[PDB]
Amino acid sequence: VGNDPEVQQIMFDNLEDASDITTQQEALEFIGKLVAPGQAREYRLKRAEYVIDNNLLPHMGVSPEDRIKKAYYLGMMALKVIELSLGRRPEDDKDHYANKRLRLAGDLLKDLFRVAFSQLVKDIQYQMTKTYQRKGDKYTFGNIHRFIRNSIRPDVLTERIEHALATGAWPGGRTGVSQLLDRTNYMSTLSHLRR
Amino acid sequence: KIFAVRVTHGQEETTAKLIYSKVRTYNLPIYAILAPSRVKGYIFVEAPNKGVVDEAIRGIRHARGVLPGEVPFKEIEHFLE
Amino acid sequence: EKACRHCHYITSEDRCPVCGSRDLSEEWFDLVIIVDVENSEIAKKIGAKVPGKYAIRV
Amino acid sequence: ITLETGIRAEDDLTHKLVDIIRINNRLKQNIEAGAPQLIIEDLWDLLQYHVTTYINNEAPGVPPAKHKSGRPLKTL
Amino acid sequence: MIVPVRCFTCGKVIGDKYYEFKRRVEAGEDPEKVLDDLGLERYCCRRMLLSHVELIDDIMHYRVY
Amino acid sequence: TTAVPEEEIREYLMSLGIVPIEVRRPDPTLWRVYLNGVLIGTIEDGKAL
Amino acid sequence: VEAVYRCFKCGREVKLDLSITRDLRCPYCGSKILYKPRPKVPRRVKAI
Amino acid sequence: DVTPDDLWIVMESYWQEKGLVRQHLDSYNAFIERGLQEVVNEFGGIKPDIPDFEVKFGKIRVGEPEFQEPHGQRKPLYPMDARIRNLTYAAPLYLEMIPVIKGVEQDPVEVRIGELPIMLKSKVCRLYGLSDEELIKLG
Ligand SMILES: [Zn+2]
Ligand SMILES: [Zn+2]
Ligand SMILES: [Zn+2]
């Protein structure tokens, strides 16, 4: 968390209040109780470790080895909170531009391609599983090229991308991102291209 | 310990094959699969517990969820005879 | 895909894997499969001994 | 509404009624067929959910039913 | 898209004087002296020649039959 | 702006004399260095950097 | 019902019967866009 | 010492060299160059539920703005053609499938995974790099 004497005093208070927990496994089981009530011990343990892996600051990674840097980031966040508590720093002022970032066409298109490609890979896997189940095995292994080629469904990707761009309804709840281009005159079109 | 899993109306037969192929990939401990035609959109899974069912039902198509509880074997004989 | 009139075992080929005869009724309206006979108690209930797929009332 | 493409655009209430009738028919068939208790309970809960969405699709504590396009249906 | 025939306000015909004005003003001659030479006293006419833009020449490239 | 590769920037910043955060704690005598919002190390002088 | 048309790109004479035509295209260039030419009857316009 | 007119002389060069829609063009070009490969690498590859079989992703690329004629074949497409015909100005996407059998790769196969709409006047668009007398002839 830090080295400041008041910071370490507050942390001593918090640690005294947190002497109930003993080891990491007890904390994992406690979170498992939090996330999966009524389930088996192992199930809660595993699915709470999953939450720790990929719901607590995923931008640090999702590997089980990423514990220490995530802990350091959380400690710095806590230090910021307590520093604000002591008046050592002012508010964030989120209206400031440093906290604002524009979502350009490329980033949004990347997100749309991500969701569409996820759907596409699910459909492809389903198709190959069906083909292996129903045709057989020697067919698929005899001609891998055909078995891969005639199982892709490009229309699944094309329809979703085209519909998302046309309607303006975006995956993740975003709406109105894509608008009809205004062509009344020169100024209207150019102004619409910069909004 | 028999469990019952809910599927879409018209693809229970295909979902049975999908489960039968899926069990090999990770070597799941599933003992048998029963999908009678007297129940629409429901299949029966033989598993030691709920967790293995949840793991084996993750990515298979047309499957929505597994009904909580363990259906007694005494209510099944007149389906498999 | 067919199923034997007697074995009730659904066959994906012309020859039944358990019976030599290619007799195949195909009337497997029901469908039951077993992964491991040694542990599945349904197979013990029906008396089957070979892993795979089976029918009931062909 | 007969859509300009020549395909009947059913009202939301009609679609919800179709779902309700389908669930009711499945429940009747399962009851007549001696289905397991858990299956009957699940079908009963599904019918209750369909009815409560048909009466009020914005009822607290339920996920609202959605159209084919993904929009929420409008009900009574 | 092409030079108007008469000044919108007074009605004097100035349709023939646009090209002459453009050429002489391009050559280097003072625009006010060129306008006074052409006889456009009232500024209502001078506005029409000074502010006009020739736009027929870039729409002719698209034909409709 | 458009993003440049992050790893090259991180390596360049590391080569300028930053010690990794894993090495020493954020002593108030030491400046903190953030790269796109994530702490990456600490330097003795910020203005020089 | 035979009628004349003008191609979009090359602007040349294309004579085709749309009612029975299945592959609408200019013969000279693969363009599928054609104009319907203006009729030759005189037309009256008020000079307002 | 410089004057505001001298600063204006420098200022107009910025618009002359960059334009007014750089925010869209640069972002789309960066997307086409790297984002597709990044998203493909994120998934890694297909893992079908088939014994001893797996598919690994390779490279991805964008072709040219085309259109698959129903009673015909693929032909070049232009923005004015697409506007009138109510088509979608898009280009096919090609992706490499690497079959993995017994944990061993072999010769890849390239398949078409779909069509990606093309931003006008981007580096993959047909109108890019053309002169005024060519744009005029293209409508
Ligand atoms: Zn047999
Ligand atoms: Zn005048
Ligand atoms: Zn032509």
Curated annotation (Swiss-Prot), chain B:
GO process terms (BP): regulation of DNA-templated transcription elongation; regulation of transcription by RNA polymerase II; transcription elongation-coupled chromatin remodeling
One GO cellular component, as annotated: ribosome
Annotated keywords: Transcription, Transcription regulation
Record-level Gene Ontology MF annotations: mRNA binding; structural constituent of ribosome; translation elongation factor activity
Role played: Stimulates transcription elongation.
Note on domains (UniProt): Composed of only a NusG N-terminal (NGN) domain and a KOW domain, similar to bacterial NusG. The NGN domain is the effector domain of the complex that mediates the interaction with RNAP. The NGN domain closes the RNAP active center cleft to lock nucleic acids and render the elongation complex stable and processive. The KOW domain may interact with RNA and/or other factors.
Subunit-level organization: Heterodimer composed of Spt4 and Spt5. Interacts with RNA polymerase (RNAP) independently of nucleic acids. Forms a homodimer in solution.
Protein's recorded name: Transcription elongation factor Spt5
Span within the parent record: 4 to 84 of 152
Swiss-Prot record, chain C:
Gene3D superfamilies (UniProt xref): 2.20.28.90
Record: residues binding Zn(2+): 4, 7, 16, 19
GO MF: zinc ion binding
Keywords: Metal-binding, Transcription, Transcription regulation, Zinc
InterPro entries in the record: RPABC4/Spt4 (IPR029040), Spt4/RpoE2_Znf (IPR022800), Spt4_arch (IPR007178), Spt4_dom_sf (IPR038589)
Keyword Transcription: yes
Coiled coil: none
UniProt-listed GO biological process terms: regulation of DNA-templated transcription
Described purpose of this protein according to its UniProt entry: Stimulates transcription elongation.
The record's note on its domains: Contains a N-terminal zinc-binding domain and a C-terminal NGN-binding domain.
Family: Belongs to the archaeal Spt4 family.
Quaternary assembly: Heterodimer composed of Spt4 and Spt5.
Protein name as catalogued: Transcription elongation factor Spt4
Source species of the chain: Pyrococcus furiosus (strain ATCC 43587 / DSM 3638 / JCM 8422 / Vc1)
Higher taxonomy: Archaea, Methanobacteriati, Methanobacteriota, Thermococci, Thermococcales
Chain's gene name: spt4
Curated annotation (Swiss-Prot), chain E:
Cofactor binding note from Swiss-Prot or TrEMBL: Binds 1 zinc ion.
Domain of life according to the entry: Archaea
E.C. number: 2.7.7.6
Cellular localisation: Cytoplasm
Entry-linked PROSITE patterns: RNA_POL_N_8KD
One GO cellular component term: DNA-directed RNA polymerase complex
Primary localization class, coarse: cytoplasm
Cofactor: Zn(2+)
GO molecular function, one term: DNA-directed RNA polymerase activity
Family membership: Belongs to the archaeal Rpo10/eukaryotic RPB10 RNA polymerase subunit family.
Functional note: DNA-dependent RNA polymerase (RNAP) catalyzes the transcription of DNA into RNA using the four ribonucleoside triphosphates as substrates.
Protein name in UniProt: DNA-directed RNA polymerase subunit Rpo10
Gene from which the chain derives: rpo10
UniProtKB/Swiss-Prot annotation, chain G:
Superkingdom to which the source organism belongs: Archaea
Cofactor stoichiometry and binding remark: Binds 1 zinc ion.
Catalysed reactions, as listed in the record: RNA(n) + a ribonucleoside 5'-triphosphate = RNA(n+1) + diphosphate
Keyword presence, Cytoplasm: yes
Stored InterPro entries: RNAP_P/RPABC4 (IPR006591), RPABC4/Spt4 (IPR029040), Rpo12 (IPR023464)
GO biological process annotation, one example: DNA-templated transcription
SS bonds (residue pairs): none
Binding site for Zn(2+): 10, 26, 29
One matching Pfam family: Zn_ribbon_RPAB4
Top-level EC class: transferase
The keyword Transmembrane helix is assigned to this record: no
Compartments (UniProt record): Cytoplasm
EC number: 2.7.7.6
Swiss-Prot/TrEMBL cofactor(s): Zn(2+)
A GO molecular function held by the record: DNA-directed RNA polymerase activity
Keyword terms: Cytoplasm, DNA-directed RNA polymerase, Metal-binding, Nucleotidyltransferase, Transcription, Transferase, Zinc
Leader peptide range in chain numbering: none
SMART domains xref list: RPOLCX
Sequence similarity: Belongs to the archaeal Rpo12/eukaryotic RPC10 RNA polymerase subunit family.
Oligomeric form and interacting partners: Part of the RNA polymerase complex.
UniProt protein name: DNA-directed RNA polymerase subunit Rpo12
